[PDB]
Design a protein around this nucleic acid. Structure first.
Ligand SMILES: Nc1ccn([C@H]2C[C@H](O)[C@@H](COP(=O)(O)NP(=O)(O)OP(=O)(O)O)O2)c(=O)n1
Ligand SMILES: [Mg+2]
Ligand SMILES: [Mg+2]
Length: 430
DNA sequence: ATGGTGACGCT
DNA sequence: AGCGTCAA
């Protein structure tokens, strides 16, 4: 009772940009706005591979990983924007720079964790405490939460979406205890007010819309965010968790979408997150390990302790290219040419990074895949990154991989290479 | 023949 | 360290 923690100590939000690469291209090209459209890379193989899709295009069934030629069969009027190609390869710079725009705005409100190119977590616990002071006990108006859903509401004793949103928000606000500065539900609510402000700032200053989740931890904030995407935010309270989790497939929880989550389902014979409550912590540790078992025991009760890490910048800068089918690299001059291409992009990004962010990478990671290997990497080795010089980095990369060429004739390369990867790591202040 | 990314865990 | 899992 009085000693059981309820994981209600923090306010955490997750901001996730809507159809991000599409919005970047739509800002640039007004002709793409409010249209079914998608972002594609490499036009020559079936119109290119789709990597992002507008909501209008999703209505037709267009999805990521579709070939654009195939997407056109579902959506004949689909518009496309192509990823930039430089030095023979797709180049994601425009989207990385657009991501910096958003992350810098979010950082004004709170210290962020850059989770991905278009997602960031924020811990709003401190900001909420401050705002609750300025809020000298006055009630929170529904007008301060114009795009907020309260998960699980309305409930109890209208057929249009916004109507329902407002009914749920009204039930929530009506039941709030605003005189108690330590009430978790009140803290979440103030967190949601701040996130409305944050999301308004992002849209005003960039043009980009996003969704957000507000809850007490990262897993619930992330789950919350997707519940009413796009262009809306969702508050998941501690009290909403039993119902929410009672029909929530285990794979929907972040980190459980792969083999571990499948093993949870198979070994325990359950389907939904809520069903995990019926196992003891030791039982879960016995099946899934000490760390995973404790994490699951707490998570299925809505409790998670993973902190929002103060990290706004990527920890690595990588350059990757696949060489599928017949395009696999079968000559030494090919391997050398493409290592240089990659190294040149890497050098460009590294020099900009060093100027912007006052740090230098000290390790170069070189990874390849040989044709016929079942593994995604046939070799992943490091060497020193002592100079931001493309010819040196490509020469060094060649040196660390040269002995995978089993061709007696070293002019040839066998087996052919189907992937090259260069990555700069282990940053030090500069 | 999705590809181009990127963080973190294990031994 | 090198490799694996999980994720945008
Ligand atoms: N497998 C993936 C997943 C995402 N991405 C890129 C394109 C996406 O616009 C961007 C963000 O990923 P995302 O959040 O999973 N999806 P996106 O923002 O497009 O749509 P939403 O469902 O978030 O509205 O990363 C990618 O290139 N390959
Ligand atoms: Mg997104
Ligand atoms: Mg995302």
């Amino acid at each position: 009772g009085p000693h059981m923690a309820t994981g209600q100590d923090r306010v955490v939000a997750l901001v996730d940009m809507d159809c991000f690469f599409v919005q970047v291209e739509q800002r640039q090209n007004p002709h793409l706005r409010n249209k079914p459209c998608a972002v594609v890379q490499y036009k020559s193989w079936k119109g290119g591979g789709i990597i992002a899709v507008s909501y209008e295009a999703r209505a037709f069934g267009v999805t990521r990983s579709m070939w654009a030629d195939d997407a056109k069969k579902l959506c004949p009027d689909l518009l496309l924007a192509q990823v930039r190609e430089s030095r023979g390869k797709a180049n994601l710079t425009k989207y990385r720079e657009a991501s910096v725009e958003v992350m810098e705005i979010m950082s004004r409100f709170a210290v962020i964790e850059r989770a991905s190119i278009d997602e960031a977590y924020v811990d709003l616990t401190s900001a909420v405490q401050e705002r609750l002071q300025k809020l000298q006990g006055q009630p929170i108006s529904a007008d301060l939460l114009p795009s907020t859903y309260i998960e699980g509401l309305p409930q109890g004793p209208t057929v249009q979406k916004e109507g329902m949103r407002k009914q749920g928000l009204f039930q929530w606000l009506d039941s709030l205890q605003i005189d108690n500065l330590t009430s978790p539900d009140l803290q979440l609510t103030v967190g949601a007010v701040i996130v409305e402000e944050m999301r308004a700032a992002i849209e005003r200053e960039t043009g980009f819309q996003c969704s957000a989740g507000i809850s007490h931890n990262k897993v619930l904030a992330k789950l919350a965010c997707g519940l009413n995407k796009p262009n809306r935010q969702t508050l998941v309270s501690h009290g909403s968790v039993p119902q929410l989790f009672s029909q929530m497939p285990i794979r929907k929880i972040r980190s459980l979408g792969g083999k571990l989550g499948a093993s949870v389902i198979e070994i325990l014979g359950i389907e939904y997150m809520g069903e995990l409550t019926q196992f003891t912590e030791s039982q879960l540790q016995s099946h899934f390990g000490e760390k995973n078992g404790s994490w699951l025991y707490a998570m299925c009760r809505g409790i998670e302790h993973d902190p929002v890490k103060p990290r706004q910048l990527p920890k690595t800068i990588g350059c990757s290219k696949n060489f599928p089918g017949k395009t696999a690299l079968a000559t030494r001059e090919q391997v050398q040419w493409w290592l240089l291409q990659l190294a040149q992009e890497l050098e460009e990004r590294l020099t900009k990074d060093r100027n912007d962010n006052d740090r230098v990478a000290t390790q170069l990671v070189v990874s390849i895949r040989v044709q016929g290997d079942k593994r995604l990497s046939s070799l992943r080795r490091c060497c020193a990154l002592t100079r931001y010089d493309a010819h040196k980095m490509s020469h060094d990369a060649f040196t660390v991989i040269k002995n995978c060429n089993t061709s007696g004739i070293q002019t040839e390369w066998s087996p052919p290479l189907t992937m090259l990867f260069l990555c700069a790591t282990k940053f030090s202040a500069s």
